[PDB]
Write a protein that binds this DNA or RNA. Structure first.
Ligand SMILES: [K+]
Ligand SMILES: [K+]
Ligand SMILES: [K+]
Ligand SMILES: [K+]
Length: 178
DNA sequence: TGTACAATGGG
C-alpha cells in the first residue's frame, strides 16, 4: 500500500447497508431519475446534465469525496446556469426538484456503501497487467453502472448484481490491454 | 436495450 492506504481507510469506515436500507435508497434513486425525467421534460435540458448538476450540489454531504474511476466536475457555470433555470422554475414543480435531490443523494450513499465490495473483488485480479488502483477505478466504474441499472423489485440482494458488473468491468478492462 | 442466489478479511 501507499497513498491508497488512505482510500481503503476512507471506505472501511462506511458501514454496510441492511436490506431495508438498500431498498429504500434504491427506491429513492429510481424515483430521482423519474423526477429528473419530468424535469428534463419541462426545462428541455439533458437528463444526464440535470442529474450531474444535482449531484455536484449534494456531493457536499458525501462521506467520500475523491472516489477513483468516478467522473468529477462538471463546470460551475453550467452548474450555475442550469441550477438557475431549475430553482427559478414554477412552484407546482418544486416537489420534483426535491425528489431528484433525494435520489442523487441516495445514489451517492449507496455507492459509498459498496466500495468495500469493489476492493474485495478487485484483489482477485491483481497480477494481470493492471496496477491495483486501475482495478479499483474500473471496479468503481462497473459499480456505478450497476446502481444505474439495478431493479430492486427483483428481490435480489444488491451485492449479487453489483458483483456481476464489477467483474464485467475489470474483465473488459484487462481485455482492452491487448 | 439485456446482462441478477450472495458476495463488502477469505473459504
Ligand atoms: K479470524
Ligand atoms: K485472527
Ligand atoms: K473467521
Ligand atoms: K468464519
Amino acid at each position: 500500500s501507499d497513498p491508497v492506504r488512505q482510500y481503503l481507510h476512507e471506505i472501511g469506515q462506511v458501514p454496510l447497508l441492511t436490506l431495508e436500507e438498500e431498498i429504500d435508497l434504491a427506491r429513492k434513486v429510481e424515483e430521482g431519475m423519474e423526477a429528473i425525467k419530468k424535469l428534463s421534460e419541462a426545462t428541455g435540458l439533458d437528463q444526464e446534465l440535470i442529474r450531474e448538476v444535482v449531484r455536484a450540489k449534494i456531493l457536499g454531504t458525501a462521506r467520500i469525496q475523491k472516489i477513483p474511476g468516478l467522473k468529477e466536475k462538471p463546470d460551475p457555470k453550467t452548474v450555475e446556469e442550469v441550477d438557475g433555470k431549475l430553482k427559478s422554475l414554477p412552484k407546482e414543480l418544486k416537489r420534483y426538484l426535491h425528489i431528484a435531490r433525494e435520489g442523487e443523494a441516495a445514489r451517492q450513499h449507496l455507492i459509498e456503501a459498496n466500495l468495500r465490495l469493489v476492493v474485495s473483488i478487485a484483489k482477485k485480479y491483481t497480477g494481470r497487467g493492471l496496477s491495483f488502483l486501475d482495478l479499483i477505478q474500473e471496479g468503481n466504474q462497473g459499480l456505478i453502472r450497476a446502481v444505474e441499472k439495478f431493479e430492486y423489485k427483483r428481490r435480489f440482494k444488491f451485492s449479487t448484481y453489483a458483483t456481476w458488473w464489477i467483474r464485467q468491468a475489470i474483465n473488459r478492462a484487462i481485455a482492452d490491454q491487448a
